Design a protein around this ligand. Structure first.
Ligand code: W5B
Ligand code: W5B
Lengths: 198, 204
């Protein structure tokens, strides 16, 4: 009693009410410059059970989901999906970049696997370091990221990265980078440096 | 058997500093509970303004959260705190609230300093302590609305038509608040509260 509520992938998929450890908020953003950033960022919904997750997931999937210049974000209740939030400003993200061909084959499965890591508390005590996840749907290639709260907590960040990579099913040859938000916020060429790789 | 704690027991577990030896030293609750907060920030939608603070399922974890948090008396008007059983949202259109209602007490502006904190704590101890015997299963949660015109504390129950459960909870709640017989609490269905018409099914 006082124990973390943890669900594995098989359990979550069998529910497709069971309470979640955290309440989560789904956000939607399109950078439309005729409107201000507060108008463009929309809270879609909040949930705190497995069944309510699945009802929301099924409904968004039936709405031409993952639109072609939009971002979707799932964050713990009380964290805005912007790096300047108190819970994100000292943090960073594990980033998965998908090439054009992978929009057809991997984007849908990889976004779902990320969401199940978050809601299922798959990183043991290091799940407390997770803030949320973001998918950026773009013509040049889609990006999926897990955002974490403290870019100097090496042991939390690397455990999250390695469990995440395992849950995505990526081969050991494919390496993924963690970028500090402070480094991503400064545009310095084609790429941002990786604080860590796994 | 139902896990029931009286007021004296809960109050003895407070500020304890007990060694939770073997993770078996805490006193389990019958239910897991979630504390919610609603902020008055009208620039955001009400959905963005409802936040889950924390969940707990032992007496000692209740007290650690209670001790940490800001008191109701100190909330800016327009804020709400709610304690609900895990899996029930503190909104009337939740499946577990839509056919139910609440026992409501309203406090005047001066009772904020004298009675609001004490009534809110006594309500929380009724909930976590399962003080309504088998009828505790009809309890969804409790809400405190801090407002300029006068504060409101309510116990929400799941089913209007369970007359005996609703009336027993009302009578026990009034006793635990210490209200004189002359001051009454009223029960209103959520469906009736939701319609502004100018509505107590029961009073005790
Ligand atoms: O098909 C989609 C596309 C974008 C977001 C989601 C989603 C639904 C519920 C919770 C979290 C994310 C589903
Ligand atoms: O001082 C307060 C103010 C508002 C809520 C609470 C609370 C704390 C723990 C469980 C339930 C309610 C305490």
């Amino acid at each position: 009693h006082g124990a973390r509520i943890i669900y594995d992938r098989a359990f979550l998929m069998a529910c497709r009410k069971h309470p979640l450890q955290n309440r989560w908020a789904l956000w939607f953003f399109k950078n439309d410059k005729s409107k201000t950033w507060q108008a463009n960022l929309r809270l879609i919904s909040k949930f705190d059970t497995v069944e309510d997750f699945w009802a929301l997931y099924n409904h968004i999937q039936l709405s031409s989901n993952l639109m072609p210049g939009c971002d979707y974000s799932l964050f713990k209740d009380g964290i805005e999906p912007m790096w300047e939030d108190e819970k994100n400003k000292r943090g960073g993200r594990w980033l998965i970049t998908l090439n054009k061909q992978q929009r057809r084959s991997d984007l849908n499965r990889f976004w779902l696997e990320t969401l199940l890591c978050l809601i299922g508390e798959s990183f043991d005590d290091y799940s407390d370091d997770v803030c949320g996840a973001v998918v950026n749907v773009r013509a040049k290639g889609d990006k999926i990221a897990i955002w974490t709260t403290e870019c100097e907590n090496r042991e939390a960040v690397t455990h999250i990265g390695r469990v995440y990579k395992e849950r995505l099913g990526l081969p050991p040859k494919i390496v993924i980078g963690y970028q500090s938000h402070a480094d991503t916020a400064t545009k310095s060429g084609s790429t941002t440096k990786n604080r860590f790789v796994v």
